[PDB]
Symmetry: C3
Subunit: 497 residues, 3 copies
C-alpha cells in the first residue's frame, strides 16, 4: 500500500526517493529515510549502540585511523612550511603559542621523561612525523609534559569532565535511546570535556587567558538543561564581565586580588585547579536531587564557598546569599512534588493517554511509565503529561538551583528556569491531568472504549527507536561490573553499582 | 495516612525527612518542606508579609544590625590595611575610585555641610569607625555629598526607581501573595533600584563610565516581563554597541555629539539626569495600558523624543519611527481585546475549569476570577485560561511597545514579545476556550456533574499561600492613607488612593 | 448592541474612545481600533496591500518626497557646518569615513563617469544640493562609484538580499495577509537588505571593519524563524569571537590566514564577495525543504565548503562535520513527516477544530486547510493543530539545519531549533490530534452536533484580515509574468512562474 511519501508524491508531482540522493525534496515529503553509515559504539550497550564515523576525532584511541593522502616522514620545520599554505591558521595559532614560541614562555619547568623541554614543541611532537601514521591526541599526550593539570582533569567524579563521555554518554538513556546521528553533538560535547585539553584553552594557541573567560565554558554550560551561562550572565557579575572584558587584564592567574569580576573559572577552577567539580558541595544530578547545602553536615563546603566570595565581599553577605539559595531551592521542590503527585496519580488511575503500552517501548524495551521507578524519564516518545513532568524536574527545578547559585535575581523569580516558570508548568501539568480525567469520566459514563491513537506507538521516527529491538542478553554487564569508573543506575545494568 | 513523601519513601528506600537536614533527597521525593526563619515584612500587608533575614542589606534602615566578629575603633587607613588582606577586591575597587584616589578626581566641587571634601572618602567615612557598629548605607549617605543626583534619584513617580521597593514590592500582589523565599530576588532587584546608588555604577569603583553601558541596566531591565535589553540588543543600535564597545570612549559624558551609539543611559538619563522615568510620555504599566504617544495631547513629549533622536538623525525619520510605534501598539491591542473577550466569555458562561471557587483563594483571600475587576491577574495558582490571558497582556502586549520603542524589527514582528507571538498566544487561548466549551457541552448533554480536581485547590505549594489565612482587619490601611508615596490600586486597600 | 468596549466602559468607568486620541486606556479595554493613514503598497497585491508612509525611507524610488522645512541651495561645506549643530553624529560619522576624510583612504581607484574621485564625497554628493529636493538613496547611488560591490549585491537569487523586499515582502503571504502596521519591521528588514548598502557597514562611517563582525548580520539573521546568530554564537567559533573581538585586528580583509576566528562575513562573503548567497549548496527555503548537501550531485559545492574550512582545519575534519550535518538533517525530517501525517490525517478525518470553514478566510480569500496544497501554512488565524505544524516545519526543522551548519552542539540536540525541541513539538502535535479525535468520537456516539466557536472566525483582529475582501480580478498577474525577478509560488498568481 502507499506510504506517506507515495501519497505526497502523487499530490506534489515529485517522485519518491532516498533522502541522500541530492534531490531537493519539497517540504521533505517524498524523501525516504536512509540509515547513515555507522561504526559500533562502545560501553555497556555496544550490542546496538552506534556512532557516526566522525567519532574518530573525539574517541581517537578506539576509532582513529589514517585518512590522509599526503605521504612522507617530515621534520617539525617541514610540517610548518607546508601547513603555512595548507592550513594557515593552525600554524598561526601554533606560532602564537608557547609550544611554538620561546619568547612567550614563562619558565614553568616543563619536563618530559624527567628532562627539561627546552625546544619548540612542534606539529610532529604532538602528531607524529609520518604523514600516513598521524596521531590524534587525547589528554594522554599532554600528560607527558603536564602531569599536574592532567591528574586533576582526571580526578573528578560522576558528573564531572572526567567521566562525561565514558560514563555519561555511553551509559546515558537519552543517548543510547536515539539514532546515532540525532545525538552526535551529545557525544562530542561530552567527549571534548573528557578526552581533550582544548575545551577551555582551545587549540592551537592553548592560551590560559582565553580559558579564564566565560566563553571557555558557555558553549557547553548553557541551555534549558543547565542554564548556568545565562544565570551568570544575568547576574551583576555577568554584566560586569561584559562591561570590563575589553579592558581588563586576562593575563593574571586566577588568584585572590587579581580580578574584580569573577568568572566560571575564577570560582570553579580556584587557583587554577583543573578538577572544577571538587568545590561543589555534593553532586545532585544538576539540582534534580534536593539537598540543603547550608545544613550542618555540609558546613566545611559552605564555609569554603563563603571564603571564596570573601575575596571580594563580606563573609556575612556571602553567607546570606548562599542561605537564599538554600531557602529558594527548598521552596522550589514543593512545586515539583505537587507536579509528581498529579502525574503519578493519573498513571495509578489509568487515565494517561497514551498509557505506556500505547507508546513505543522505552529504550530498555519496556512499556513502563517514565516517571515511576524503573522507567525512563524523558521528553520524547511519551505522553504529554510525562513530557511536562520531565520539563518540570529537569529544565525548571534544576535551574532554580543554578539561578540562585549564580545570583540571577531575574531567573530566580521571573525568567528561564525560575519560580514563576515552575508555576506556569505546574498549571500546564494540572491542565493536562484535568483534561485526561474529564475525557476518562465521560468515556466511562457513556461506555465508550477509548483506544490510544496508533501514532503514539508507530511512525517513521518512532519505528527507528532501539527499544523495539532490545532482547535478553544484549547488555555488556561486565562494563557495569567495572569499579575503575562510576556508573549510572540503569534499570537493565544487571549488577551492583 | 501516608503523605506523598511517605509513599515515595516506601518505594525508594529513603527515609522521609526535613528538607533542611542536609540529606541528598532522590528527586526531592521524601523531603518535607520546612519554613525558613523569617523577619516581618514592611508595608500595608505587614500583618503577614515576611522577608528572609538577608533583607538587612537592602532595607538597612529597618533591618540592619551588627553581625561582625571583629572589634575595635579604627582610622580609615587601618580599614584599608586589614581589608587589603580580608576583602582585597573591595580595597582595589576603592583605590581605583575617586573617593580613594585624588589623581582621578575632576574637581567637581563636592561639599559636605557646606565645606569642600578635599580628603579621601574612606571605608570609615561611609561605614563608621567602630567595627561593632558598622553602617550599611542607602542613598541617604550619598546625599551628604551628592545632593543633585540623590534628589533626582528620589524624584520619580510610581513605576520608577524611586518607589520600586517601598510601593512596588511591599504593595505588589505577586510579591505579597507568595512565600518570602520564593521572591527574594524581587525584593532585592527592586530595592537595589530604590535604596542604593550602586545599581548602575557599582560599588566600590562607582565609575560613571561603567554606568553609561547597557550592562548598567540589563540585569534588571530584561526578560519576559519587560524585555527592553533584548529589544535594544536586537536593534541596530544594540548591534553597534556590541561592535564598538571595546574601542569607544566611555569616559565621555552623556551629551549630544559625544557618542555614535546610543545606550539606555544616553536616551533615558539624558545629560546625566538621574530621574530617567521623566522622559517617558506617560506611565502605562509597562505597556499593558494602551496610549497613543503620538496624539496631540502628548506633542511636547513626542517632540522631546524627536529632538533626542535628532542628535544622530533627521527629525522626520525619528518622527516616522515613533509613529510606527504608535500604529504597531494600537494594532497589538486588537488581539488582546479578542483574547480578553474569549476569556471573560468563558467565565460568564461558567465553563472555566477550575472556576475560581475550585482554586485556592487569591492573595486577598477571595475566590474571584483573576481577569475581572477586583481579581488578581496572575500566572500561578489559577486556570490555564487565566494563565494564558495574563501572558497575553503582560508578557506579549506590553513587550510589543518595548520592541517598537527600541527599534527591534525582529521582535516587533517574529520574535519574543512580538505580533506573531501574540498571534500564537491568541490561538492557544482560543484552543483552551474551545476545549472547555466542548467538555461542558458534552457533560451537560449526558448529565455528568463535573467537579474540578482537588489539585487545583490543594497541594504542598498551594497550601503555603497567604490567601488561606487572610482575615478581616489584617490590612494596615494607614499605609495606604499616606500621601508622601503613591500606591497600587489593590482591592483590599480599604481607602482612597 | 454593546461592543466589548461599551461593556468594559460600563464596568471600569472609562469612556469608550478612539485608540489614537491620547487617552490612557485601562488595559486597552475601552479603546476602539482606528486605521492608521496608509499609502498603497507595490507588487502583485497592490489592489489591497498597504504600507505606513514611513516606507519612504526604504523604497525611496517609489515613495520619497520632500518633507524638509529648511530651504536653500548649499555647498558640501555648508551642509557640514549646519549639520554639525543639527545632526552632530551624522557629521562625526562622515568625518570618520573615507568619503569625508582623505587620510584614511586606501587608494582603491574609485571612479565616477570614468574619472577618478579625488575630492571628498560630501553630504550634497549623495543627497543633492537643494534642501527642498533632497534625495534618499539606494544602491543605485553607490553604483556610480562602487560598481563591483553593487553588481554582486544585485546578483543573488530568490532568498538573497537581492530580492528580499521586491519579491519576498511584496509577494509573501504573511506580509500581504496582515494589516500594514503589524508588519512594518518585515518590510524594513527585508528592504534594508535589498535596497541599501548600509545593512552591514552602517551609515555614515561605512566601515568595512564593522561589516566583518557578526553584529553586521545578527539584527536580521536571528530568531525562531532562522536562528543562525544563536547557532553561530553557541558554537566554539562564536565563543572565540566573543573572547577575541576586543583585541583582534578587524582591519584585515576577509582572506585566508588573516583571521583566527571565522565570522558570518568570513564564511559567506568569502574574499569580500558581496553576493553571499552564492556559496550555499542550494536554496532550500531556510531548510524547510530537504536536501542532502553531501550527495554526489553537490560535490563541487561540498568540496568548496571543505576548502573554506581548510583555512583553519584538516579537510577530513571539515568533511566529517558537514557529513554530520547531512545525517542530522535527514534524521530531523522523519519527525516532520510523522507530524505532517498526524496533522493531515486529522483534516482528512474531519476532526480538526476549527475546520477551515470555521475560521476566517486565508489571505487568498479561501477556506482551505493551511497544510494542504494551495493552503497558506501559518501560525495565526488558524487551528492549534495547524499552528503547531507550522512551528514544527519552520521554527524547528529548518533550524536543525542551521544548528548543524554552524557547529552548535547544544542547539543540534537540546537547544532552540533542535532534535529534542522537535521531539517535544511532535508530542504536542500528537496531543492536540488525540484530544481532537477523542472529542469527535464522544460527540459522534452521543449524537452531539459540534459547531466550532465563533471566535475562530470573527473578532476585532480577525475582522481586519484581507481574506475577507479578496475578490476576482484583484491580482496584478502582470507582476507575476515578469521574468526579470523570480517569484513565489502563490496559489492565486494566475500564471506560470
Ligand atoms: C563565583 C562567583 C561563581 C561564578 C563566577 C560562577 N559560579 Fe558556578 N557556582 C557557584 C556556586 C557558589 C555554586 C553552588 C555550589 C555549591 O555547592 O553551593 C555553583 C554551581 C555551579 C555548577 C553546579 C555545580 C554543582 O552542583 O556541584 C556548575 C556546573 C557551575 N556553577 C558552572 C558555572 C559556569 C559555567 C559559570 C560561568 C558561566 C559559573 N558557574 C559561574 C559559584 C560561581
Ligand atoms: C577548562 C575546564 C579547562 C580544561 C578542561 C583544561 N584547562 Fe588547562 N587551564 C584552564 C584555565 C582556566 C587555566 C589558567 C588557570 C589559572 O591559574 O589562571 C589553565 C592553565 C593551564 C596551564 C598553565 C599552568 C601554569 O603553570 O601556568 C596548563 C599547562 C594547562 N592548563 C594544561 C591543561 C591540560 C594538560 C589539560 C588537559 C588535561 C587542561 N589544561 C584542561 C582551563 C582548563
Ligand atoms: C554540550 C554542548 C552538551 C551537550 C550537547 C549535552 N550535554 Fe549533557 N551535560 C552538559 C553539561 C555542561 C552538563 C553538566 C551540568 C551540571 O550541572 O552538572 C550536562 C550533564 C548531563 C548529564 C547528567 C544528567 C544527570 O544525571 O543529572 C548527562 C548524563 C548528560 N549530560 C549526557 C548528555 C548526552 C549524552 C546528551 C544528549 C544525548 C546531552 N548530555 C547534551 C552539556 C552537554
Ligand atoms: C562610600 C562612598 C563608601 C566607601 C568609601 C566604601 N564603601 Fe563599602 N559600601 C558602601 C555602600 C553604599 C554599600 C552598600 C551596598 C551598595 O551597593 O550600596 C557598601 C557595602 C559594603 C560591604 C558589604 C557588601 C559586600 O559586597 O560585601 C562591605 C564589606 C564594604 N562595603 C566594605 C568597605 C570597605 C572595606 C571599604 C574601604 C576600602 C569601603 N567599603 C568603602 C559605600 C562605601
Ligand atoms: C534611544 C535611542 C533609546 C535607547 C538607546 C534605549 N531606549 Fe528605552 N525607550 C526609548 C524610547 C523612545 C521609549 C518610548 C518612550 C515614549 O514615551 O515614547 C523607551 C522606552 C523605555 C522604557 C519604558 C519607559 C516608559 O514607558 O515610560 C524603559 C523601561 C526603557 N526604555 C529602558 C531602556 C533600557 C534598559 C535600554 C537599554 C537596554 C533602553 N531603554 C534603550 C529610547 C531608547
Ligand atoms: C542608573 C540608573 C544610575 C543610578 C541608579 C545612579 N546613577 Fe549616578 N550616574 C549614572 C550615570 C549613567 C552617570 C554618568 C552620567 C553622565 O552625565 O554621563 C552617573 C554619574 C554620577 C555622578 C558624577 C556626576 C558628575 O558631576 O560627573 C555622581 C556623583 C553620581 N552619579 C552619583 C549617584 C548617586 C548619589 C546616586 C544615588 C542617589 C546615583 N548616582 C544613582 C547612573 C546612575
Ligand atoms: C529585577 C531583576 C527585577 C525582578 C526580579 C522583578 N522585577 Fe519588577 N520590575 C523590573 C523592572 C525593570 C520593571 C520596570 C519595567 C517598565 O517598563 O516599567 C518592573 C516592573 C514591575 C512592576 C510594575 C507592574 C505594573 O504595574 O505595571 C511591579 C509592581 C514589579 N515589577 C514588582 C516586582 C516584584 C515584587 C517581583 C517579583 C514578586 C518582580 N517585580 C520581579 C525588574 C525587577
Ligand atoms: C554617500 C556616500 C552619503 C554621504 C556622503 C552622506 N550620506 Fe546621508 N545617507 C546616505 C544614504 C545611502 C542614506 C539612506 C539610508 C541608508 O542607510 O542607506 C542616508 C541617510 C541620511 C539621512 C536620513 C537617515 C537618518 O539617519 O536620519 C540623513 C538626515 C542624512 N543621510 C544626512 C547626511 C548628512 C548631513 C551628510 C553629510 C554630513 C550625509 N548624509 C552624508 C548616504 C550618504
Ligand atoms: C564558517 C565557519 C561559517 C560561519 C562563521 C557562519 N556560517 Fe553560515 N553557513 C556555513 C555553512 C557551511 C552553511 C551551510 C551551507 C551549505 O550549503 O552547506 C551555512 C549556512 C548559512 C545560511 C543558510 C544558507 C543556505 O541555506 O544556502 C545562512 C543564512 C547563514 N549561514 C548565515 C550565517 C550568519 C548570519 C552567520 C553569523 C552569525 C554565519 N552564517 C556564520 C558556514 C558558516
Ligand atoms: C553585508 C552583507 C554587506 C552588504 C549588504 C554590503 N557590504 Fe560592502 N562590505 C561588506 C564587508 C564584510 C566588506 C569587507 C570585505 C572584505 O573583503 O574584507 C565590505 C567592503 C566594501 C567596500 C570596500 C572594498 C575594498 O576595495 O576595500 C566597498 C566599497 C563596499 N563594501 C561597498 C558596498 C556597496 C556599494 C554596497 C551596496 C551595493 C555594499 N557594500 C553592501 C559587507 C557588506
Ligand atoms: C529581519 C529583522 C527580518 C524580519 C523582521 C523578517 N524577516 Fe524574513 N527573513 C529574514 C532573514 C535573515 C531570512 C533568511 C534566512 C535564510 O536562511 O534564508 C528570512 C527569510 C524569510 C523568507 C523566505 C521564506 C521561505 O520561503 O523559505 C521570506 C519570504 C521572508 N523572510 C519575508 C519576511 C516578511 C515579509 C516578514 C514578516 C511579514 C518576515 N520575513 C520577518 C529576516 C527578516
Ligand atoms: C601539541 C601540543 C600539539 C601541537 C604542537 C600541534 N597540535 Fe594539532 N592537535 C593537537 C591536539 C591535542 C588535537 C586534537 C583536537 C583537540 O582539540 O584536542 C589536534 C588537532 C589537529 C588537527 C585536526 C583538528 C582540526 O582542527 O583540523 C590538525 C589538522 C592539526 N592538529 C594539525 C597541526 C599542525 C599542522 C600543527 C603544527 C603547526 C599542530 N597541529 C600542532 C595538539 C597539537
Amino acid at each position: 500500500g502507499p506510504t506517506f511519501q507515495d501519497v505526497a508524491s502523487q499530490v506534489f508531482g515529485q517522485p519518491v526517493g532516498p533522502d541522500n540522493d541530492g534531490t531537493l525534496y519539497i517540504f521533505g515529503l517524498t524523501a525516504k529515510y536512509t540509515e547513515p553509515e555507522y561504526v559500533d559504539g562502545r560501553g555497556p550497550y555496544k550490542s546496538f549502540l552506534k556512532m557516526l564515523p566522525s567519532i574518530r576525532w573525539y574517541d581517537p584511541e578506539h576509532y582513529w585511523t589514517n585518512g590522509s593522502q599526503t605521504e612522507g616522514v617530515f621534520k617539525n620545520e617541514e610540517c610548518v612550511l607546508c601547513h603555512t599554505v595548507q592550513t594557515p591558521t593552525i600554524v598561526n595559532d601554533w606560532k602564537q603559542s608557547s609550544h611554538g614560541s620561546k619568547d612567550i614562555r614563562r619558565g614553568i619547568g616543563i619536563k618530559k621523561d624527567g628532562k627539561p623541554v627546552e625546544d619548540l614543541v612542534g606539529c610532529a611532537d604532538c602528531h607524529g612525523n609520518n604523514h600516513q601514521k598521524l596521531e590524534m591526541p587525547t589528554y594522554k599526550l599532554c600528560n607527558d609534559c603536564h602531569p599536574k593539570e592532567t591528574a586533576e582533569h582526571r580526578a573528578g567524579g560522576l558528573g564531572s569532565h572526567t567521566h562525561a563521555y565514558t560514563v555519561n554518554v555511553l551509559e546515558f538513556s537519552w543517548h543510547v535511546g536515539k539514532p546515532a546521528e540525532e545525538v552526535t553533538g551529545c557525544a562530542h560535547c561530552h567527549a571534548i570535556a573528557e578526552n581533550r585539553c582544548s575545551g577551555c584553552h582551545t587549540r592551537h594557541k592553548f592560551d590560559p587567558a582565553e580559558a579564564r573567560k566565560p566563553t571557555a565554558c558557555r558553549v557547553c554550560h548553557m541551555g534549558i538543561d543547565h542554564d548556568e551561562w545565562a544565570m551568570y550572565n544575568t547576574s551583576i557579575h555577568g554584566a560586569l564581565y561584559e562591561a570590563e572584558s575589553a579592558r581588563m587584564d586576562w593575563g593574571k592567574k586566577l588568584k585572590k586580588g587579581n580580578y574584580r569580576v569573577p568568572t566560571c573559572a575564577y570560582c570553579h577552577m580556584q587557583n587554577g585547579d583543573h578538577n572544577p567539580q571538587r568545590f561543589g558541595t555534593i553532586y545532585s544530578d544538576m539540582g534534580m536531587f534536593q539537598v540543603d547545602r547550608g545544613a550542618p553536615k555540609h558546613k566545611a563546603k559552605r564555609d569554603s564557598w563563603i571564603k571564596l566570595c570573601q575575596d571580594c565581599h563580606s563573609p556575612r553577605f556571602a553567607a546570606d546569599k548562599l542561605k537564599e539559595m538554600d531557602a529558594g531551592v527548598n521552596l522550589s521542590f514543593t512545586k515539583w512534588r505537587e507536579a509528581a503527585a498529579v502525574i503519578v496519580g493519573c498513571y495509578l488511575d489509568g487515565v494517561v493517554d497514551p498509557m505506556p503500552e500505547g507508546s513505543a517501548p522505552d529504550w530498555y524495551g519496556h512499556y513502563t511509565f517514565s516517571l515511576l521507578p524503573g522507567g525512563d524519564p524523558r521528553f520524547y516518545a511519551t505522553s504529554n503529561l510525562e513530557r511536562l513532568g520531565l520539563e518540570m524536574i529537569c529544565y525548571l527545578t534544576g535551574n532554580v538551583y543554578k539561578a540562585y547559585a549564580h545570583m540571577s535575581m531575574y531567573n530566580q523569580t521571573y525568567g528561564n528556569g525560575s519560580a514563576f516558570e515552575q508555576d506556569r508548568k505546574l498549571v500546564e501539568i494540572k491542565t493536562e491531568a484535568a483534561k485526561l480525567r474529564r475525557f476518562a469520566a465521560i468515556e466511562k459514563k457513556i461506555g465508550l472504549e477509548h483506544k490510544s491513537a496508533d501514532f503514539w506507538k508507530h511512525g517513521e521516527y518512532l519505528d527507528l527507536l532501539p527499544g523495539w529491538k532490545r532482547k535478553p542478553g544484549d547488555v555488556d554487564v561486565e562494563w557495569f561490573k567495572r569499579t575503575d569508573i562510576p556508573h549510572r543506575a540503569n534499570a537493565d545494568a544487571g549488577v551492583e553499582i
